[PDB]
Design a protein around this ligand. Structure first.
Ligand code: HEM
Ligand code: HEM
Ligand code: HEM
Ligand code: HEM
Lengths: 141, 146, 141, 146
């Protein structure tokens, strides 16, 4: 459960991401594909080389979804409804992989937001990505 | 893999009584019912919409047979599971694109089926031996991923 | 999310457990200690040998909690609230271990309820134990 | 676990710029803040009430320094981590009763701290090499559990 203080922390940090959200989303996927190569089994149809348009596009769509969730943090299930259907009925990514991407997004943010990534903010971001992952897997069965 | 004499004896003795085809079809069917996202690899198998349809589907039962047959062959080579499953490891990674977490899910479902079929004979120590073996096999199958 | 069919399945299966619930709770912990030896770190003060009365006692307490959850399946967070407080703030069992006891729970029911553990009931029970585990870890942070 | 010569050089080159005592206290404080159930071993350490109290506590800083000092000395033995951490493995299991999932959580917190400290120098490939190392250390410390 996200506390009011967590909500404030996430909104502050995501606000400082600003217009770079899509680049950061793409870097998080590149980081996950290199560190955790079994995640590449869900993208056999992708050119996975560095800077591919497919990876940059995936980055931008995932950033947009996270921005929607930050703006609707009190109503995530309803705001992410279409994405929770798509992941449950069509993509069917095993739920363990959401923890690996969340880790790689946290590394990406740490490496680009030196001033903002304090212990308390790290804790709030980790909880927020765990809650998003929970909403996206809620309709799997 | 390293198993005590007690663990190895427990594994082999129980496996002598398994009907590989029946147990295979039951375990693969339950995998697709219990964790339905695993149905993503089997879109050409027919109707998988309800539990009865999955359990009675002939292509699911044939796939079960196939897989437990290779699992069975691995039980004869417990000292070198990685060398034994190297060719299938590469196949599942490069051609079939299967996330190896699926191997761990099948392993737990297989344990549940053995308990269901054998009852009180599937004791705590017997289960422990089998938990090590299914973990060993999943690790052997994930070894060549890149 | 538990559907009406899931709830019906869980109540019928737990109804057949009946007065054996504590026996089966104890066997699940015994199965868990031998299968996954890392879970023994949370009970250094226990005699963990087969037949142990401390393991029998722990099994009965857990099984009674689960009976309470089945009876309040639409109100689980409030019914298990003291228990979620205890695990979060005092016992502090890492969340990964609730997956291991849930599997061991399921193995124990399969071994004792052959007619009742059908594919559909197995799927409802796994969903119910994941929901219980989610309530028990909801206040950890 | 296996590193290419390239991965080894990347790990060692970055570790030469690390202040082990500072990094140790920051990773171990963040472990206790971000995953607060890991505070269960440290009731004797005093005030852990808020993130600032945890990060400023001298007993938490002392523990971090001890733990990272051992991690650091382990980096000179990447070809034999199981042999290097064997005795510490036994101690964490038999006497300290630490669930080995805690080692994995520390590993991921340490990778996040290195990214925070090195910024753009912590590239995707350098992270991938450190991910192998922390999984290897965690596996080596869990090896003697029984
Ligand atoms: C923070 C968690 C995640 C979010 C918010 C998310 C969001 C999205 C979005 C917005 C899309 C695009 C839908 C469209 O085309 O309209 C998508 C597609 C996709 N996602 Fe998820 N995703 C997440 C986690 C994952 C993970 C962990 C994986 C696998 C490791 C994954 C695999 C995919 C795949 C394979 C597609 C389809 C790509 C294509 O063929 O274009 N996602 N995701
Ligand atoms: C004990 C673990 C497993 C073993 C030993 C195993 C073994 C096999 C074997 C022997 C084949 C036939 C390949 C051939 O054409 O020569 C096969 C095919 C296949 N396996 Fe695995 N398997 C295992 C687990 C899994 C799991 C858990 C999944 C996914 C849920 C999976 C997905 C597939 C698929 C999609 C095929 C191709 C089926 C087709 O031809 O349509 N396997 N496996
Ligand atoms: C279905 C999940 C679980 C339920 C319903 C549950 C419930 C309970 C209950 C009712 C108690 C006794 C509290 C009292 O004294 O009033 C308890 C205690 C305890 N539980 Fe949990 N528990 C669960 C999972 C776990 C797991 C997975 C572990 C560790 C692997 C665990 C470790 C403990 C410990 C160490 C105690 C204290 C035992 C003692 O020293 O007396 N529990 N639990
Ligand atoms: C990279 C992983 C780790 C390494 C290399 C490591 C290493 C060590 C070392 C060298 C000691 C001192 C041993 C002695 O007294 O001779 C120690 C003690 C200890 N460690 Fe670990 N540790 C690690 C992770 C952890 C984690 C994650 C926890 C718990 C969250 C933990 C809990 C403890 C405790 C409770 C002590 C005893 C402290 C005392 O009595 O003051 N360790 N560890």
């Amino acid at each position: 459960m996200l506390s009011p203080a967590d909500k404030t922390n996430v909104k502050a940090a995501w606000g400082k991401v600003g217009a770079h959200a899509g680049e950061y989303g793409a870097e998080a996927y590149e980081r996950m594909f290199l560190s955790f190569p079994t995640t590449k089994t869900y993208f056999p149809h992708f050119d996975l080389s560095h800077g591919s348009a497919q990876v940059k596009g995936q980055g931008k769509k995932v950033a947009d979804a996270l921005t929607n969730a930050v703006a609707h943090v009190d109503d995530m299930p309803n705001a992410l409804s279409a994405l929770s259907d798509l992941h449950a009925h069509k993509l069917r990514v095993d739920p363990v992989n959401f923890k690996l991407l969340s880790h790689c997004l946290l590394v990406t943010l740490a490496a680009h937001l030196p001033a903002e990534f304090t212990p308390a903010v790290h804790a709030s971001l980790d909880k927020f990505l765990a809650s998003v992952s929970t909403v996206l897997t809620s309709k799997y069965r | 893999m390293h198993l005590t004499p007690e663990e190895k004896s427990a594994v082999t003795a129980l496996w002598g009584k398994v009907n590989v085809d029946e147990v295979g079809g039951e375990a693969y069917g339950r995998l697709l019912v219990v964790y339905p996202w695993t149905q993503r690899f089997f879109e050409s198998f027919g109707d998988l919409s309800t539990p009865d349809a999955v359990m009675g589907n002939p292509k699911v039962k044939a796939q079960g047979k196939k897989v437990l047959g290779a699992f069975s062959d691995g039980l004869a080579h417990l000292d070198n599971l990685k060398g034994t499953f190297a060719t299938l490891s590469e196949l599942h990674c490069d051609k079939l694109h299967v996330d190896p977490e699926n191997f761990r899910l099948l392993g737990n479902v297989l344990v549940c089926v053995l308990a269901h079929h054998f009852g009180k004979e599937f004791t705590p120590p017997v289960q422990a031996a089998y938990q090590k073996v299914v973990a060993g096999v999943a690790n052997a199958l994930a070894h060549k991923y890149h």
